[PDB]
Amino acid sequence: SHMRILFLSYRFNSLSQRLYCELTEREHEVSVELDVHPDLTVEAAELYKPDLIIAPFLKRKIPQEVWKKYKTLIIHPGPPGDRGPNALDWAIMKGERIWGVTLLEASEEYDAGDVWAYRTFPMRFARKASIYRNEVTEGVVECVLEALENFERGDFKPTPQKEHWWNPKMEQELRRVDWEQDDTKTVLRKVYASDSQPGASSKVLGKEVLLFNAYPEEELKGKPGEVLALRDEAVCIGTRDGAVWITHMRERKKESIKLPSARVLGEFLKGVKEDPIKPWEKVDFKTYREILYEEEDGIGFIHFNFYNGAMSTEQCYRLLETIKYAKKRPVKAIVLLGSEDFFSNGMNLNTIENAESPADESWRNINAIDDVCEEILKTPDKLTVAGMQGNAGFGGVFLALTCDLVFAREGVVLNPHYKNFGNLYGSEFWTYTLPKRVGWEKGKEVMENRMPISSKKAFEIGLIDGVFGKTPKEFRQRLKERIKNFINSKDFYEFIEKKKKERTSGEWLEEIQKCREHELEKMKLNFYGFDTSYHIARYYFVRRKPHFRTPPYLAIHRRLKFS
């Protein structure tokens, strides 16, 4: 009753990773062929001979010789009959109240195959990636699981399409932000529809950029088109009726790096000064707050909204400062909440690659993230909690594991490994935390494994402490109650006195230092040594270079002993 399934993915992205967990944790075998070349895709199908092919994320036609021979199902992020490559972009730009996803057969005509499954859902006014990672992904899981049952039943007939409409690839003239004709609702709509690819073109300070990650501004006003303010490298720009923050941009030039706005504009920003708001301040108006600290019921909650979960060196220090502020407050627990889209993805490879010496910036970034980790570990008199509302990868996973307790929302996917970025040893105290949670035997096993694992699986194997909630609000609410209940019990004071004993002794303190030394000595080699596979992987990832091979850890069918 177990299927052999082949994924064709342009990139092994968040949706492909979630489907991989859902299918393999039901004891199907999934092999992945990245979309490298049509002849390689033909070979992959003939090698693997799947029962079923699923294309979760595809950027071009599947060769007829594949899908005429192997049942091939295609994910389309629009409701049935919707066709074309930017379904979600158009739904956001048109303001569709209701949207959907459709699982359909490959066909000669684009998006014209018979329908196997579909779901619909109400839209949010939100980033396309947010819709994609939540409503679309959850819709797609449901569709795929349904089609797996249908496939194994045996007499299923898909439903041919009836009405159909075509939306083209959306041109940048459509996305383009005109600061004088566009109110804030319109700017948000265009950036949302273009986030996190391909960005909304615009002219800022007479400079051509792509705009990512917008936020409204009810307070500051100014000339439409002028930079009103700076804040944690985000710029505030006047709109036809208000203002809007733009945290990230990139130069409108091929293979340019997406970066915080201040690092793109550069010396166009002489003179513009900061408008800081410390995360523990309260305001009554909508603005942009990267980090937010809020106290409730004896709990200090640290939200940190780092774009794509990447923590640059400076962002790490802002978080370290907020943690240190929280540890001086009269709270029994401190909770790291990340953002709704990501808990954390470790070091910011984009700021690293953009530095004059990526090696040097990697050294600053990994020491800064370790400093955050070490601050959390050295908290003897408070409960520490990591609350993963969204996915976590690389250092981000292990930042969480420094907390006393780790909880994840349902549907969260973890990537608790580094070697996919060419041989990184990793740090973030993983050599102290992972064996403490799971033992070395089980520990080496998961980090040698290079594939994602669900928060459910992480829970089963003891990597995290619980999974619950379907939405971020529901998760935060149930988390707040679990913590509130604990910090008002005997087990809390027992716990704290035991934790105070451990983390004030010189033994534990030097065991902690020696783990950091060991990890950073290996990380020094990754960064400065003869082997440069980390810097090479970084280059292709950050620059969105296409793949030239599928490595064997993804492609079962490209392995030696493969029979």
Author numbering: -1 to 561
Per the authors:
HypX will catalyze two consecutive reactions, the formyl-group transfer from N10-formyl-THF to CoA and decarbonylation of formyl-CoA, in the N- and C-terminal domains, respectively, to produce CO. The putative catalytic residues, His74, Asp80, and Asp109 in the N-terminal domain and Ty416 and Glu426 in the C-terminal domain, are perfectly conserved among HypX homologs listed in the previous report. CoA is constitutively bound in HypX, which will act as the prosthetic group for CO biosynthesis through the formation and the decarbonylation of formyl-CoA. CO produced by HypX is used as a ligand of the iron in the NiFe(CN)2(CO) center of NiFe hydrogenases.
While CoA adopts the folded conformation in HypX, an “extended conformation” of CoA, in which the ADP and pantetheine moieties are extended in a linear fashion, is observed in some CoA-dependent enzymes. Here we examined whether the extended conformation of CoA was also available in HypX and found that CoA is able to adopt the extended conformation in the A392F-I419F variant. We solved the crystal structure of the A392F-I419F variant at a resolution of 2.3 Å. Though the electron density of a part of the pantetheine moiety was not observed clearly, that of the ADP moiety was clearly observed, by which we were able to identify the conformation of CoA in this variant. In this structure, the relative orientation between the adenosine and pantetheine moieties of CoA is different from that in wild-type HypX though the position of the adenosine moiety is the same as wild-type. The results of crystallographic analyses and MD simulation reveal that the adenosine moiety of CoA is fixed in place and acts as an anchor during the conformational change of CoA.
